[PDB]
């Protein structure tokens, strides 16, 4: 995660995609309804 | 978050709702948790009752003045407690 090639596939319209983006889920604090998360930056943008 | 509706032409303290009852936090204990109104709140028209958690009506409601500034005729209000800290929201709407 965080570098070039964090998501990969053999073609743009394929069905088998692998990735590793370091996603973790947290516990809700305010009680309305939602799901919070945090994630790393995309390596594509960092390479550009 | 919370939603209650008030009728036109009230007479200084009929009834609105029961906050502590709907939120489950129980009576006889909130007198020490620090039950309070937030200073960034508190429309002039309503009043709290820190003991039995009910909502008053302070002065007679006037639709003309109340939503001449916020066209969707609504009213905002918040409360908070301590040990540990919380923050809740309530909205009231004026009918016709």
């Amino acid at each position: 995660p965080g570098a070039f090639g964090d998501i990969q596939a053999s073609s743009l319209d394929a069905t088998d995609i692998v990735a590793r983006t370091d996603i973790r889920l947290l516990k809700p604090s305010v009680k309305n309804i939602h799901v919070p998360y945090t994630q790393a930056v995309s390596g594509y943008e960092m390479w550009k | 978050q919370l939603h209650y509706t008030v009728q036109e032409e009230q007479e200084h303290g009929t009834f609105v709702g029961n906050i502590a009852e709907d939120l489950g936090l129980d009576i006889t204990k909130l007198s020490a948790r620090g039950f309070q109104t937030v200073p960034n709140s508190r429309t002039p028209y309503l009043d709290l009752n820190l003991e039995t958690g009910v909502l008053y009506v302070n002065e007679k409601i006037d639709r003309e003045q109340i939503c001449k500034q916020s066209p969707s005729c609504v009213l905002h209000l918040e409360v908070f407690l301590e040990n540990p800290l919380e923050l809740f929201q309530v909205e009231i709407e004026v009918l016709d």
């Binding site: 309305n32 | 916020s70 066209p71 969707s72 929201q89």
Partner: protein, 314 residues
């Protein structure tokens, strides 16, 4: 398949972080995504309402339909003259269809969508970075009138173009507290006039049922032991993180994303020709540039020795 019959879909309402004042609220114009991959500043916006269609689903280009802050939770409509967009100042509206909008905005740090005067005024703001971009090796504020022509990619203004699809599902349950009642240690169920409502309670064993008139749930004593909701909801909604799902969460249709990305041509400026001075094995370039510009050199032998520099001044 991909369909276009909007008489089978409905709008919804979500949870905006920064409502009018500061507080979080429930809003009819929640902002889901923003996209700015174009080359002249345009952006695409997805919201929770449906623009360009009338109260029943048929199409006309002067109206939109939304969900209601009141009693009886139906769909309502109003005219498009009341929609505005802003980041630091007002923006121009370029197209609209379905859940989607297209606009052109100055630099800033936020994006806003508001319903101006009338019943049900609101807004919603979302954090987003928007700056200025240019194509080529020279900077400019405007595209000039004398220059060259190169290739660029922009957003199409038509609405029949496509770039993908989104999925639609069946709507889950939504419980209203108004349908419950309490009279001297007995609990009752109060439907709106002449419609079927479903109850569900536990004060002992489990219990369900559909009713049509005031009914007494025997065994329970408090109000916070049952719930109730109405039971004919054949209208599809979007896979949004602010709703509760049905027991059957399978896909029932697909819908288009308009405003495709196409290739076109763009004009760019030309700098001021430099003067050269010659000595024994070397040169000297006298340059002029009133904005940043680029310079690159390389050697034609086995070694390259590349350079690169952005230049300002003389």
């Amino acid at each position: 398949s991909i369909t276009d019959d909007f008489t089978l879909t409905s709008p919804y309402l979500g949870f905006c972080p920064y409502c009018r004042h500061s507080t979080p609220c429930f809003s009819p114009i929640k902002i889901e995504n923003v996209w700015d991959e174009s080359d002249d500043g345009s952006i695409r916006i997805q919201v929770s309402a449906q623009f360009g269609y009338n109260q029943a689903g048929t199409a006309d280009v002067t109206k939109f339909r939304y969900m209601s802050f009141d009693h009886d939770h139906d769909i309502k409509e109003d005219s498009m003259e009341k929609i505005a967009i802003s980041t630091s100042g007002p923006c121009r509206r370029l197209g609209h269809k379905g859940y989607f909008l297209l606009a052109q905005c100055p630099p800033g740090d936020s994006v806003t969508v508001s319903i101006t005067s009338g019943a049900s005024e609101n807004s919603c703001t979302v954090e987003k970075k928007i700056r200025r971009k240019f194509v080529g090796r020279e900077e400019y504020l405007f595209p000039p009138v004398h220059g060259k022509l190169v290739k660029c990619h922009v957003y199409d203004h038509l609405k029949e173009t496509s770039a993908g699809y989104i999925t639609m599902h069946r709507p889950g349950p939504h419980a209203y507290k108004s349908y419950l009642e309490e009279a001297s240690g007995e609990v009752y169920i109060k439907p709106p006039s002449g419609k079927n409502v479903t109850y569900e309670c536990k004060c002992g064993d489990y219990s369900t049922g559909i009713v049509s008139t005031r009914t007494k749930m025997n065994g329970c004593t408090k109000a916070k032991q049952c719930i109730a909701y109405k039971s004919d909801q054949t209208k599809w909604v979007f896979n949004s993180p602010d709703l509760i799902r049905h027991t059957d969460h399978s896909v029932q249709g697909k819908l288009h994303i308009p405003f495709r990305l196409t290739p076109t041509v763009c004009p760019v400026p030309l700098a001021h020709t430099p003067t050269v001075t010659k000595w024994f094995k070397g040169i000297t370039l006298h340059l002029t540039a009133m904005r940043p510009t680029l310079l690159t050199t390389r050697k034609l032998g086995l070694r390259a020795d590349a350079t690169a520099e952005w230049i300002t001044g003389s």
